[PDB]
Structures are given as structure tokens and as C-alpha cells.
Amino acid sequence: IVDLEIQSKDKSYAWFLTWMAKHPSVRTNYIQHDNGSVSTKFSLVPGPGNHWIRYKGAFILIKRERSAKMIDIANGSPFETVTLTTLYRDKHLFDDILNEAKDIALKTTEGKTVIYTSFGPEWRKFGQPKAKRMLPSVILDSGIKEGILDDVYDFMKNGKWYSDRGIPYRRGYLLYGPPGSGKTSFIQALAGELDYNICILNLTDDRLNHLMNNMPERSILLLEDIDAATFSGLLNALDGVTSSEETITFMTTNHPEAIMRPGRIDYKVFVGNATPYQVEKMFMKFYPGETDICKKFVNSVKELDITVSTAQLQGLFVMNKDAPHDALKMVSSL
Amino acid sequence: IVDLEIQSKDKSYAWFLTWMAKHPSVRTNYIQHDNGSVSTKFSLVPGPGNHWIRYKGAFILIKRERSAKMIDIANGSPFETVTLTTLYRDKHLFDDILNEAKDIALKTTEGKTVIYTSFGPEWRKFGQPKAKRMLPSVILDSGIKEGILDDVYDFMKNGKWYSDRGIPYRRGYLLYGPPGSGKTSFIQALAGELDYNICILNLTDDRLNHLMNNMPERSILLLEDIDAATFSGLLNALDGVTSSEETITFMTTNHPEAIMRPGRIDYKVFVGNATPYQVEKMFMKFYPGETDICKKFVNSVKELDITVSTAQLQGLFVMNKDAPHDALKMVSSL
């Protein structure tokens, strides 16, 4: 016989039980009332006893066991273990099977960009997981959406070039413009693209360096409102940021008035007020189709426009949802 | 044979023992004296030994077991387990049975809107469970009770519309009016309608954001007395409130004198002093029937009325309970 031990600590433990449940174990009853309110309750049923399965003509024997003495502290439950056991020659099938199961599990599970935050000189989770912001969803000027999504895509591929030269492998960015132009939305959409986690930090200088040094894995630092500052300490800690991998640090400011040297900020781009392209693309995002109205909106917004910003468009477009005709006369007056 | 393990940790453990007690286990003696005072005492009787039952001609065998070594910390008792065991072919009946039992349990158990509150930068329970406030019980102006119970009912159904556009899935409300108009009563009745929990918070700005971010599941935030304020920090934290689901934030003020932009407050309605419809509906709520007196009250309250409010009506209606004739002359003078 052969063995394959998957212990209850591994992340591929719940995945495998989910797979074997659906093979032709948690059981969760879930009642939705007349309201959207939900009454749901889950119960497990993985017997300390062995079962059988037939995957591709194998007759795999599976046991699941609990320890009568040991207690896990990660989940507060005794230590469990699933043991597959089959024909000896085809033990190598097990990995294949689990890989398939893992893939079918990972296809459904879509991530969510956790946001860490500062809690003194230590990063704590904050704001139980958000949802992916879906880069097509953010609409900014014509060329800026691609001028950055390819600089980063090169910076994620130039490890050898930066390593062999002996310079640190990091990069900064400076999104600057008027308040309400869609900077933060774009940063979150980009982090969702690379499924990293935004360790947000808004502006003490001595612990700022500790915060810079101690970032979780697969993160994208964000520095809000850099025009509010300790400056020498800021430059010192910003130059002394290191990692085993990329260290991206976006920076947003409402008015950016030495810092522009490489190693520090080196890609500066100006996201500003709305353009006749941005308004058209937002109008087509809200109202699929209906091309005729778009122009009838644009030539209307060509007049009485001073600080027309995309937050204003979002507000004046959500209040007249599923009704462009109301928007035609409402937004034109604001 | 088959098995079905329900362990003592699951919420469907007490439910099942309650069901099997009433099948044709806690035993609680309960003595009410001549006073309303109560002497009550409960004792359990679930033997570590197996029993039998006949549900629909099945002869189900049930064991209940205690662990001689392990101690649960949630209830301070050893770890218990109920094991049903019957004919092998009809193992699938067990789930059906438990579902029926759960439903018959949930029909009787009526919830109670727990109120969380602020304890520094962390939400603690407060005020051991209240009772449902029963929306018909709160009486406000003619159209305002439905103009909000349908906006929310749409906002609970527009997840895809708000998600696909890439905007956060939250919404604010601004109930404004004179003190004593019945705002808080309506908010509690509405939360009881959606069986959520009011994480009440009355007005420090840095921890307000932490409080906003960390809300329990299935909650409805409430911000009392917003006309008392850090303002820029208020707007900043209010725009940076996120969740995995809806984030409703009602706001009450006694005198509401930039905030009205969508994403922030977007549904404003004015609940004010008493109307000749409100007084009639309160009078009919207190005194079922007796239509003749209603008009004889209304034309009486048409005179000498300045700041007639529903709290005043509640006070002057409860002091003459089961006696409208006393109210006719008492309330008319206040």
C-alpha cells in the first residue's frame, strides 16, 4: 500500500474535503426569508472512519482521523488528518488528483485585496476584505491607464537588471492632481490587478521607518498626502526601505509644491480634471449602448464647466440611475 | 450502519435535544409564587448512554457521549456529541429531520436586536437584548414610512449594479428634525425589520475611523447628533468606510446647520412635529376602535398647539391609559 498524509493544518485540507463532497465534510443549511435577511448554519460530517471513492478506476481508500489528545490552536479543534491509500503502483496519481481539485477550487475563489493599516509602529489588518475594483471600472485620461500598467509590468520583470548592477530593486510613483480625480480608485484597481495588498498609510518619523521596513508579503505601499511634511526624516526613511523583492510606493498629493531623484520618486504623472473622453467613457460605462445620448450630453457639458471632476460625475450619474433623460437636465445645471 | 455526528459546539446541538425532548435533555423546574417573583432551576439529563426513537418507521438509534478528558471553554463543560445511527439506505433522512426540527425551533424563537456600543476604539455589547419594536408601532408622517422602507429594499438588491460599476456598496441617510420626533424609534424599528444590530455611536477622530472599519456582521451604523462636529476627519473617515456587504449609516440631527454629496449622505428626509394624521393614528393605536372620540380629540388639539410632538403624545396618552375620557380633558390643556 501507499500513503499520502494531508494534515488539518495545511490549506489544501479544506479544499480536498470540498472536492470530495462534490464527487459523484461541511454541511451548511442556509435559509433566506422573505427579506434579504439570512439564517444560515453549518455542521461538519467528516467521520473518524474510512470511506471509499473511485476516481478513474482506482478504488481509493480514504481515512480521516482526529487526535484524542492534541488540540490545534489555529482553529481551536483537535488535530485532524486525511489519509488516501490505493494500488501501490499509482500512488503518483494522488498529486495529480489534488492538483486538479485545487485548480477547480481556485477557479471559483476570486480574491479580495485586504487593506493593512498603521497601528503605532506595526501594521494591522483593517476593513474586512474589500472586493476587486476591476481596472476597466476606473476611467481616467486616454493614455495614462496604459503608461503605468506597462512601466510596472517592466519593473516586475527587471530583477536581474537591477540586481546585477547592485542597486536596490524598488520604485516610486507620484500621482498628483486636484482632489477627487480618481487616484485612490486607480491605485486600488491596480493592486487588485496584481492581487497585492494595500498597506495604506496617511500622514512620528522614527516609527515611519519601522513601518516601511516591516511590510507584509506581496504588498504595495501607499503614501497619502505627501505635501503635509518631517522632511529630512522622510527622505532618510524612504531611501532606507528594503525588501527581498519589489517595494512599490505610490504617492498622492493634492498640490505638489530634490524628491524627484531616482531611487526616490521617478515616474510622475498628472491625473487631473475630467476630459471630454473621460465623460464619454463614464457615460458609456453607466448606460450601455445609447450612443445618441452621449454626444447630447457632451455638448451640453461643454458649457458651465469649471472644476468638473469624476467624483462629481459619479454622484450626478448614480442619482439618476437607469434614467439618462433625468441626467440630461439634472447634471447640466450642477 | 451510517453515522451523523452533531458535536456539542454546533448551534444545532441544543436545538436537536429540545426537539427530541418533545418527541412523543434539559429539565427546568420553574415556580412562580403569589408575587410575580420566580424561583426556577434547570437540570440536564442527556445520559452518556444510547436511546431509541421512531420518527417515521425508522427505529433510529441515538447515542450521546461526553469526553472524560477534554473540556470545552465556550460553555465550560466537557465535549459532548450526539450520534444518530439507523438503516443504511435512509441515512439521508437525518438532514431532513434536523431541518424540520430547526424550522420548528426557529418559528418559536423570535429575535432581539442587540445594541453594540463604543468602548474606546472597539465595539462592545451593551444593554442585554432589547425587543423588536414592530414597525407599525412607530407612527410618523403619511408617506415617509414607505419612502425609506423601499429605498433600502432596493439598496439591498443592487449589489450587482453597484459592483459592476466599481463604486463601493454603501449608503447614508439623514433623518433631521426637531428633538422628540421619533427618529431613534423608527431606526430601531427598521433594524428590527431587517434583524440587524444597531452599533450605536454618539458624539477622538482617529479612532472613529477604526470604529467605522470594524463593525460586526449584519449591522446598521447609527450616528447620533452629527451637528456637533472634527469635520474634515469626519468626512475622511466617512468616505473610508468599507465592508464586504452593505454599510448603512443613518444620521440624526436636531438642526442640520458639501456633506450632501452621494457616497456620503444621499437620502435626506425631514421628520418633524405632529400632523393631524399622526395624532389620529396614535389615538387609534392606543384605543382600538372608538372612532367617534378621535375626531373629538383632533378638533380639540387643533387649538393651542405650538410644538406638539409625538413624545408629548406618548406621555399624555400613557398617563390616561384605558381611559380616553380623561385624555380628552387632560391632554387638551398641556
Among chain B residues, CA nearest to A51: B2
Q: What values do phi and psi take at A144, rounded to 5?
A: -75, -25
A185: enclosing H helix or E strand: helix A183-193
Among chain B residues, CA nearest to A132: B166
Q: How was this structure determined?
A: cryo-EM
d(CA B247, CA B170): 5
The grid cell for B213 is 472599519
Resolution of the experimental structure, in angstroms: 4.6
The DSSP-derived string for B222-266 is EEE-GGG--HHHHHHHHHT---SS--EEEEEES----TTSBTBEE
A45:B4 CB<8 A: yes
The grid cell for B36 is 410575580
For A29, the closest of B102, B161, B164 (CB atoms) is B102
| Contact of B46 with B19, CB cutoff 8 Å | no
| Residues of chain B positioned with their CB less than 8 A from the CB of A130 | 242, 244
What does the angle CA A81 – CA A86 – CA A91 come to, to the nearest 5 degrees?
90
Alpha helices in A24-92 (DSSP H): none
Task: Tell me whether strands A265-270 and A171-176 are parallel, antiparallel or unpaired.
Answer: parallel
d(CA B204, CA B233): 10
Rg (CA), chain A: 27
A39:B106 CB<8 A: yes
The DSSP-derived string for B75-100 is SSSEEEEEEEE--STTTTHHHHHHHH
DSSP designation for A264: B
Chain breaks in chain B (C to N over 2.5 A) after: 24, 203, 229, 257
| Neighbouring residues of A16: CB distance < 8 A, sequence distance ≥ 6 | A6, A82, A98, A101
A47:B193 CB<8 A: no
| Contact of A29 with A41, CB cutoff 8 Å | yes
Burial A101-119 (b: 16+ CB within 10 A, else e): beeeeeeeeeeebbbbbbe
The grid cell for A21 is 463532497
Among chain A residues, CA nearest to B100: A29
DSSP designation for B290: -
A115:B242 CB<8 A: yes
Range A17-25, long-range pairs (CB < 8 A, 24+ positions): A17/A46, A17/A82, A18/A105, A19/A101, A19/A104, A19/A105, A20/A53, A20/A62, A23/A53, A23/A55
- Percent of chain A as helix, strand, coil, to the nearest 5: 35, 25, 40
* Separation in Å, CA B266 to CA A35, A134, A255: 23, 25, 29
The grid cell for A113 is 485585496
Torsion angle of the four alpha carbons A325, A326, A329, A332, in this order, in degrees rounded to the nearest 10: -100
Partners of A197 in the β-ladder = A219
d(CA A155, CA A190): 14
Closest C-alpha to A311, from B164, B240, B261, B169: B261
d(CA B126, CA B129): 8
Pick the residue of A32, A114, A128, A284 with the most B CBs within 10 A to test the interface with B by mutation.
A128
Tell whether residue B112 is among the known ligand binding residues. Answer: no
Kindly state whether B32 is in contact with chain A, defined as any CB-CB distance less than 8 angstroms.
Answer: no
Q: What values do phi and psi take at A30, rounded to 5?
A: -155, 110
Closest C-alpha to B50, from B91, B14, B3: B3
d(CA B63, CA B166): 53
Dihedral sign computed on CA atoms, order A323, A325, A329, A334:
positive
DSSP designation for A262: B
A285:B213 CB<8 A: no
Dihedral sign computed on CA atoms, order B61, B66, B67, B68:
negative
The total number of residues written for chain A in this structure: 334
| Residues of chain A positioned with their CB less than 8 A from the CB of B205 | none
Among chain A residues, CA nearest to B241: A127
